[PDB]
């Protein structure tokens, strides 16, 4: 993993030692180069994992996530350099440094062979994320958003730290491989019930679970565009990845401990999809849609089937790409009208035709239109849930109906109808914005040709 | 602010005639029943006091609501018609011409010269029409959404730009 | 009761301005001015041959158009598809599986050469 980690670390000296006007060029070029290198991790094995050293390993679950992170960094850089054009050289370098630090922490988080190292790296992601949100966000609400995000995450994470050190003291190891191979069944007792809750709640609040999600609208809305991109695309997936890793020590306690969480997510996907139907803030609507897809991921991980895990992996990848695309599309309109209100700028298809096409593609992917990998993940999870209990088809069908309704409603209200009469500053789409959408959408569709690359290690 | 009694009687006359036309369809039948309807409206044409005239209007409106055609004929481009607001997707605002690339504009030199002439007109006349609006609007602000004509030679009616330069009904 | 003098005057002034605006939307003979372009030799033979557009030239122009369309849209794709099926798809089992032909009494089987026996004598229902 050092052939990936060290180039990323080298982004910092290069960023700080480059000319004031070569900052974005250099960072973009070499982050794309690092993303090219990360693709070689997709050469996986059927049975074993890629166990490089004692401290880093890679399997079919973490390799697509690593590729997604390394890909997100350059797109972040293209999205940021517009609203940060008037900033000072040192402050731009600090923003780039925060993004690089976040990518480095995420890369080591997804490959950490030990549970406590994973914990520290997954907690380290808070610091640059919080800095981005609170320093470079636009509104006075960014401070409260930062506090919510920080303290929700930490209230989740500290009991996990206690549980992890207890597990290390009783089992002798926190090594992922050892944990799998020396797996003990978890008995039915209050001690084990609370150990389960401690092992699960941090990833629950990270995803987030419905009812523990109130930080996410604040944080994903108040953050600058790159912050929203990472928060929606890679940071939510830390909960799903960690839950997939740690559920191997929670059986058979997960059989009945998951019932409250299964109920919460199955109903809260309905609840948050309905909320999207009435959201007056475009960025808030996009933030609220992440909760439903992540609720589907929660159900898939909690029912513990090969098909459910495959669907959850594919859904995490597809949601990362699609949610980041939607945030970028909303940000392009925000940078023109300086507002997130959705009915402010209507009838945009007759002013920005290719951007309207990008909007249609993003809405279609959020719709989970087949054969997109969004649909593959959603359908696999739906089938596994149907096996788990047939009655799950009522709620999941309702959810896909409501998802269609709000996705197409957003498309219609922003792109269609009559343009607003007094808004006379909708300049033509820049090459940079169109390239941002294209680099969001093209790899999403190419994955349909090789879907096994994102179906996880249970494929 | 409000509709007078005469206005309301006329609106009901027009609406009832149109729904009668939707019911009758054929032109001779519509002519016959339209003359009968006009006789109904002419029966109380000269009514002394407006209390019973208004009661007649109320009864006529209740009758109209009972007997209206569920789907009356609608002119295609009128609200609720089948061609209503069909051409909004082509009505590009005129400020988009400024954001054209200089190579798009060079294909239309004469048009953009005329457009610069209109823009110079608008820029020049703007101050003396805000002035006229101030000099004509009584204290407390406007009471009606009406606007004045230009009153002296050389001036343009205030707030004329977006009325005069509005998109055509069949733009693209 | 009709337009007021102010309404009538403002309407006629807006009418004059609007009519001047609408007359100004007309294009000039030079407009739009086109930028230069290049002509390929395949279409260079047509501005010298089809410059007349005779009935015998129209038939040959449609023939060239239809032959080029036929080869590029039918013959090349059918070539690629037939190659794909004949040498890649059917190089794996059960990829193209064909429902077997119905076999009737009397029939001679091509492969082996056997003759299917004729049915037994009908009980002879007579209409």
């Amino acid at each position: 993993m050092l052939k990936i980690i060290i180039p990323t670390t080298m982004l910092l000296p290069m960023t700080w030692m480059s000319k004031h006007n070569m900052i974005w060029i250099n960072a973009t070029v070499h982050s794309l180069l690092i993303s090219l290198i990360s693709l070689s991790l997709l050469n996986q094995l059927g049975e074993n994992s890629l166990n490089f050293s004692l401290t880093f390993f890679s399997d079919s679950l973490s390799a697509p996530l690593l590729v997604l992170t390394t890909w997100l960094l350059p797109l972040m850089l293209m999205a940021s350099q517009s609203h940060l054009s008037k900033e000072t050289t040192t402050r731009k370098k600090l923003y780039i440094t925060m993004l690089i630090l976040l990518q480095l922490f995420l890369i080591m988080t997804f490959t950490a062979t030990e549970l406590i190292l994973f914990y520290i790296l997954f907690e380290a992601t808070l610091v640059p994320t919080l800095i981005i949100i609170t320093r470079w966000g636009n509104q006075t609400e960014r401070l409260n958003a930062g506090l919510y995000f920080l303290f929700y995450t930490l209230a989740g994470s500290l009991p996990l730290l206690v549980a992890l050190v207890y597990i290390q003291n009783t089992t002798g190891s926190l090594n992922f491989l050892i944990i799998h191979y020396w797996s003990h069944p978890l008995s039915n007792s209050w001690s084990n019930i609370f150990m389960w809750l401690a092992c699960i709640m941090a990833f629950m609040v990270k995803m987030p679970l419905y009812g523990l999600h109130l930080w996410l609208p604040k944080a994903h809305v108040e953050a600058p565009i790159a912050g929203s991109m990472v928060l929606a695309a890679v940071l939510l997936k830390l909960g799903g990845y960690g839950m997939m890793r740690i559920t191997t020590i929670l059986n058979p306690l997960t059989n009945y401990m998951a019932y409250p969480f299964l109920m919460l997510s199955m109903w809260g996907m309905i609840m948050t999809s309905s909320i999207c139907l009435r959201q007056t803030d475009l960025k808030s609507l996009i933030a609220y849609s992440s909760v439903s897809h992540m609720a589907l991921v929660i159900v898939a991980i909690m029912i513990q089937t090969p098909w459910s895990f495959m669907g959850a992996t594919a859904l995490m990848i597809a949601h990362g790409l699609t949610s980041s695309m939607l945030f970028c599309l909303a940000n392009t309109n925000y940078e023109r009208v300086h507002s997130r209100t959705m009915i402010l700028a209507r009838g945009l298809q007759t002013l920005l035709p290719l951007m309207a096409t990008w909007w249609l593609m993003a809405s279609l992917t959020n719709l989970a239109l087949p054969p997109s990998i969004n649909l593959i993940g959603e359908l696999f999870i739906i089938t596994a849930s149907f096996s788990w209990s047939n009655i799950t088809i009522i709620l999941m069908g309702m959810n896909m109906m409501i998802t269609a309704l709000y996705s197409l409603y957003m498309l219609i209200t922003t792109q269609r109808g009559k343009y607003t009469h007094h808004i006379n500053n909708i300049k033509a789409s820049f090459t940079r914005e169109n390239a941002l959408m294209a680099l969001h959408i093209l790899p999403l569709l190419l994955l349909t040709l090789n879907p096994k690359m994102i179906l996880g290690p249970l494929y | 602010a409000y509709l007078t009694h005469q206005q309301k009687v006329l609106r009901l006359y027009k609406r009832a005639l149109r729904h009668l036309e939707s019911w009758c369809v054929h032109r001779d039948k519509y002519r016959y029943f339209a003359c009968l309807m006009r006789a109904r409206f002419d029966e109380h044409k000269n009514e002394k006091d407006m209390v019973k005239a208004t009661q007649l209007l109320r009864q006529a409106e209740e009758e109209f609501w009972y007997g209206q055609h569920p789907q009356p004929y609608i002119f295609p481009e009128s609200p609720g018609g089948t061609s209503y607001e069909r051409y909004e997707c082509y009505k590009v605002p005129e400020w988009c011409l400024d954001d054209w690339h200089p190579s798009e504009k060079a294909m239309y030199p004469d048009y953009f010269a005329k457009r610069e002439q209109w823009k110079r007109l608008r820029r020049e006349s703007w101050e003396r029409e805000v002035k006229q609006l101030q000099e004509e609007t009584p204290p407390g602000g406007p009471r009606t959404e009406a606007l004045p004509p230009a009153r002296k030679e050389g001036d343009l009616p205030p707030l004329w730009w977006h009325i005069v330069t509005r998109p055509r009904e069949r733009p693209m | 009761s009709g337009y007021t003098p102010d309404e009538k005057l403002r309407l006629q002034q807006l009418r004059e301005l609007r009519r001047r605006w609408l007359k100004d939307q007309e294009l000039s003979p030079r407009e739009p001015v086109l930028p230069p372009r290049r002509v390929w030799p395949m279409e260079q033979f047509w501005n010298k041959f089809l410059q007349d557009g005779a009935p015998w030239k129209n038939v040959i122009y449609k023939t060239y158009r239809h032959s080029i369309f036929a080869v590029t849209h039918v013959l090349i794709p059918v070539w690629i598809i037939h190659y794909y099926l004949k040498y890649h798809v059917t190089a794996k089992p059960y990829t193209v599986v064909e429902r077997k032909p119905r076999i009737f009494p009397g029939d001679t089987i091509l492969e082996t050469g056997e003759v299917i026996p004729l049915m037994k004598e009908f009980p002879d229902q007579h209409h």
């Binding site: 033509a428 789409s429 | 693209m172 | 939307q25 294009l27």
Partner: peptide
């Protein structure tokens, strides 16, 4: 008669 059609910039 040909009229000028107002459309957004298609150049970019």
């Amino acid at each position: 008669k040909r009229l000028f059609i107002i459309k957004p910039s298609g150049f970019y």
